[PDB]
Amino acid sequence: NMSFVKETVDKLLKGYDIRLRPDFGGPPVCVGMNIDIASIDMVSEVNMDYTLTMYFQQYWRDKRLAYSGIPLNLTLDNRVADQLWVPDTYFLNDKKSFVHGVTVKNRMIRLHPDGTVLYGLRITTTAACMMDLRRYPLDEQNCTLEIESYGYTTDDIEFYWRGGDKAVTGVERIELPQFSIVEHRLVSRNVVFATGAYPRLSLSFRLKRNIGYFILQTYMPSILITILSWVSFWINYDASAARVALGITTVLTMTTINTHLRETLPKIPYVTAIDMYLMGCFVFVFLALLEYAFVNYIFFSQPARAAAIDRWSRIVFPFTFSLFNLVYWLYYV
Amino acid sequence: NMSFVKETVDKLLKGYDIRLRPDFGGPPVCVGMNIDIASIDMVSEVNMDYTLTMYFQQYWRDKRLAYSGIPLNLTLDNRVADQLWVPDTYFLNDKKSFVHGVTVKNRMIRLHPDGTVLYGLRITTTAACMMDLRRYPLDEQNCTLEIESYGYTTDDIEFYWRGGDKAVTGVERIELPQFSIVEHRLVSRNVVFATGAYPRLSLSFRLKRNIGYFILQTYMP
């Protein structure tokens, strides 16, 4: 029967003022929120943000929309949401957001006989995440999603996570290649501004970065250039053009790896963990060329001393670099 | 009680002409402005601009919207702003801007019994900032935000910073990695064009660049 329901929904919307919240002038309307995370597409260090797609569900009771003659939950067409009051929910840390609109606007209105409204939205959000990159790329990051009411204070609207800690699902659905979700938390606050106190819900994730891309991308190229600079120690000191060119090209390659590394990072004034490894690897390849420049300086007058320094450098340079990697990888892991 | 308030708001909007400013043909309406800075995301030297996100609040009195029977401040749904007069405020140095629209349009209407309207907007603005790069990267830059009325002259609209020097908050919230905020200032002017004199509010920041990136990036190589 569709004629009686059409008379029922027209009865609910006749005299309905969208400008007024439920229980206007009375106790605040409680809005319960659920988030079904679809994906986290990007996590950008340069822009310090992340792109999140989710199903955002809001639950509240509107006694103007209570019906009696139907024992079913009325799922209506999504264009009825323009004729209803909805909460003014926005994301505080959101840089850029949008509701999906193919094939229709990705929203859902489900009514209940007591007036409970289920309002779902499919939203893709690029939210800001300020990142501490002092231990990059062996760092843990905490990226949040701050959910707030825009104009209604706590006297008019109260937020809560509907379901407690089970209010956010789909955290296992997140597949980032360079990240893994360690933990997610749900925080409920009240935030006081100059215009009043506002209800706040927070969804935060702990992101642990995977080291496997950076070992291949930077660490292992920087190790092999440092081993390449030790090849000069086994070459005879008369080969001046051969040992200087080994010292030149290993020093210049470390400069091209450092510059390439900077491009993938924001313009931070401090030093990251991969910067400490490249500056440590630059010292080893610079002292390998300075070792020949001391050998070339003395191999005419003192040929036995210069042959001793070449023999000394064949075992001290791999030992100090293994000691450098031992202090480095036990400090950051 | 929601039926008496619905009769009260329908009384305010019946016969309301959005085409006319408050006190049309009389003294200019004073618009008080507050800015809460959310963030400054980017500062680009190549494009000579910066991206700013803020909460832009406007305060004015409209005697057509004064109500008597309710002793409360009426916070209405944000779609009532299309049925009200609002100031034609625009950013003069702004290159690209938008009001946030998730989950609803990020705006707020709060009415007061004497007719005072609080109109808030969450705006992300990419504003132009011409930079003197003669001392780059040890330079200080002055990036402004020029707030002006578009069509109403000073005979119809007057701007002021509501709260004096406390009208702009959230300057400590700005976290740029390569910059630090030295000082911010608030300027109120009148700017004369061929079409008349227009009210002007200016919010400027002094940006000191951090040298620590350019040491690692260029100086030390």
């Epitope: 840390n93 300020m130 606050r189 009240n190 935030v191 006081v192 106190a197 | 809460d36 400590e172 905020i181």
Partner: nanobody, 108 residues
Amino acid sequence: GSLRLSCAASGHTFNYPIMGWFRQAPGKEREFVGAISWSGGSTSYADSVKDRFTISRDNAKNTVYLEMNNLKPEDTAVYYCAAKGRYSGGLYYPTNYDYWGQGTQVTV
């Protein structure tokens, strides 16, 4: 005279970039004195302590100091030190601050 207080922090100070000084006179409300950002150093002050109190910090010791110069008998309160999250709004409001100091009783 001129007095200098000093608040030391330890832990996850990146997620709490703003330190604030508060005071609570006996029988009165907890009053905002001043605020300071860790990264940077952009300060804010109340009107009753402006151009008399200076707040700054060093990020090495993780130490925030409140230099109280030109003391007055209206500055007799337990001075608290508090930390504020990033997406908490309003420096002036002590409800937005999460981790608090102990609070020393100061009487001039």
